[PDB]
């Protein structure tokens with residue numbers, strides 16, 4: 584789909600059996616989810632944004648369905664207030680910016 | 683142009699006579715610039731991101747050339763480590779996400 588940007592580009596995702604809403608975020612290197620049970624091992628990670636850094640749990644090879652497009656990759660889990668779909672995943676779904 | 687997302691979608695901008703690089707950020711409501719002299723009055727504002735908030739100066743009706751596309755709108759100036767082009771400006775330049 585072609586998403587304009589008059590509102591937040593929120594999409595439905597499916598990750599770990601759960602339905603979430605998430606923001607297609609070209610300003611995010613990484614994909615970051617809140618309030619998901621993600622199963623298995625992970626590695627400690629820090630991501631920075633405006634106003635500072637959060638600790639996150641890095642999960643590799645996580646399966647994600649973003650707006651009916653399957654991607655597999657790194658998903659950070661941590662206390663972000665918005666589910667973020669970052670470029671690692673946006674590239675996997677063929678997502679581009681256009682103007 | 684059609685920008686893929688294999689790297690940060692950084693563009694050249696002109697703002698207040700200055701040439702900056704900025705990130706086309708679909709996850710930003712607002713456009714936030716660092717290290718620019720912006721002339722005139724403003725109002726105090728707070729933006730939130732990952733890890734917290736920053737205080738910004740809000741400038742209204744600021745002229746921006748983003749990748750050869752002129753936009754006029756609200757530009758926040760504050761201690762962001764990345765110049766951000768947010769949706770208020772991305773809409774003005776006709777920018778969409780596509781996959």
Ligand SMILES: CC(C)[C@H](NC(=O)[C@H](C)NC(=O)OCc1ccccc1)C(=O)N[C@@H](Cc1ccccc1)[C@@H](O)[C@H](O)[C@H](Cc1ccccc1)NC(=O)[C@@H](NC(=O)[C@H](C)NC(=O)OCc1ccccc1)C(C)C
Pocket residue numbers: 608609610611612613614615629630631632633663664665667669707708709710711712714728729730731732733762763764766768
């Ligand atoms: C989500 C992250 C993975 C992403 N960061 C990255 O990808 C970074 C560069 N990479 C990275 O961390 O890699 C690992 C690393 C570790 C150590 C050293 C080096 C590298 C990010 O924060 N990206 C942001 C762009 C950016 C990049 C670098 C530096 C600064 C900003 C926005 O796109 C991203 O969408 C965040 C997401 C977010 C929003 C809100 C809360 C939590 C997270 N939005 C923002 O920070 C923007 N906020 C918003 O637009 C919010 C939604 N509106 C807002 O605050 O409005 C004012 C308001 C005030 C009060 C109440 C209501 C509204 C900001 C640019 C204006």
